[PDB]
Symmetry: D2
Subunit: 109 residues, 4 copies
């Protein structure tokens, strides 16, 4: 079994940069990216750092680039960093796709 009583969210916004793909010592892929979601004039931007693993990480790195409008479903995680001792909220991604609101997409596989 996985987990229960975790805190899920869905964020829609734009990648701040190309996803960063790396491999662990074991050859597991991991991709990191930040989703910037701007409410609305425009409001202040929410920046959520995201992590995704394995085959989905490769698919992300192959498919998406800086500025891509994405829809991301995942679970909030806290990482403790740095100053006096601080925590930052990140997103462990369960699913991501490029939004079709202002774009079309050639889907393969």
């Amino acid at each position: 079994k996985t987990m229960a009583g975790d805190t899920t969210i869905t964020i829609v916004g734009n990648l701040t940069a190309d996803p960063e793909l790396r491999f662990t010592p074991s050859g597991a892929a991991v991709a990191n990216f930040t989703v910037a979601s701007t409410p609305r004039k425009d409001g202040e931007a929410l920046f959520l750092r995201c992590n995704i693993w394995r085959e989905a990480a490769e698919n992300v790195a192959e498919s998406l680039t800086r500025g891509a409008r994405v829809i991301v479903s995942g679970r909030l995680k806290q990482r403790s960093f740095e100053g006096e001792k601080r925590t930052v909220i990140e997103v462990e991604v369960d699913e991501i796709g490029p939004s079709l609101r202002y774009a079309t997409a050639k889907v393969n596989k």
Copy 2:
């Protein structure tokens, strides 16, 4: 609006999205997302496929066209939208109500696929 009930659903399209036009000439696409959950069996110690949930979705205008061009039967999608109840005739003098998703955003999941995004 305020006080909308939002939902995120992940699953596979049951069929190619059906694209139609309203009297106003507005595009509208309709499709069903089949969400299969996974159940852990304690006994066997293995995950199994649970019972799919089927939600009918409506999307409008340019997004409708984008979906109808991009997505096909069986595509794995991620859908964010709002649950909306509507009632319909049925002929024998009884209204049936249905709960549908009015889609705000949809995209193909990259869990098992790649996509080439054509930002219009």
Copy 3:
């Protein structure tokens, strides 16, 4: 383990009626109620039938009455009923509480 890839939602609205409490042959409590959520003039009402089990069911039946503003977190389930053969969307409740938006509450236990 529980489940994964289930479809969760949060609904805020008002109970249409007092919760209905019953006991199964085994003495397990079950409560059923409907949450009516009205968007906005006012929009058209969404009615979601809800189920909750065991001690939380008793707490619900003791605490809440018709018209109560509630916040309900749970998972969508489909039940097949009746006509030709139809399905209805229901909510298997994970947590519920009375909203404090227009009310206060004496909480005990």
Copy 4:
């Protein structure tokens, strides 16, 4: 607004909500929800307590007063709101950003408790 990121969190208050007033005389209450998830261990075949997530929450006006009167340290709550980023001074010339929940609705969970609702 449109394009807000909403969240539902369930957990326990870390302390009594702190109630304060703005220069406008608007009430504001601040509190932290500690959400403990549960982890299934395959090996042992038992659930354990996972690692709590701590989200700082802000609520305003009458709801702030309602919370400050009704809820205490350790209360199990269900919170629906919007994630909001804000930045703050810190003195040594570096701004820190924090992600907080702007609360739309909160209520005490009835999982382990009863409540007597006083609809004002």
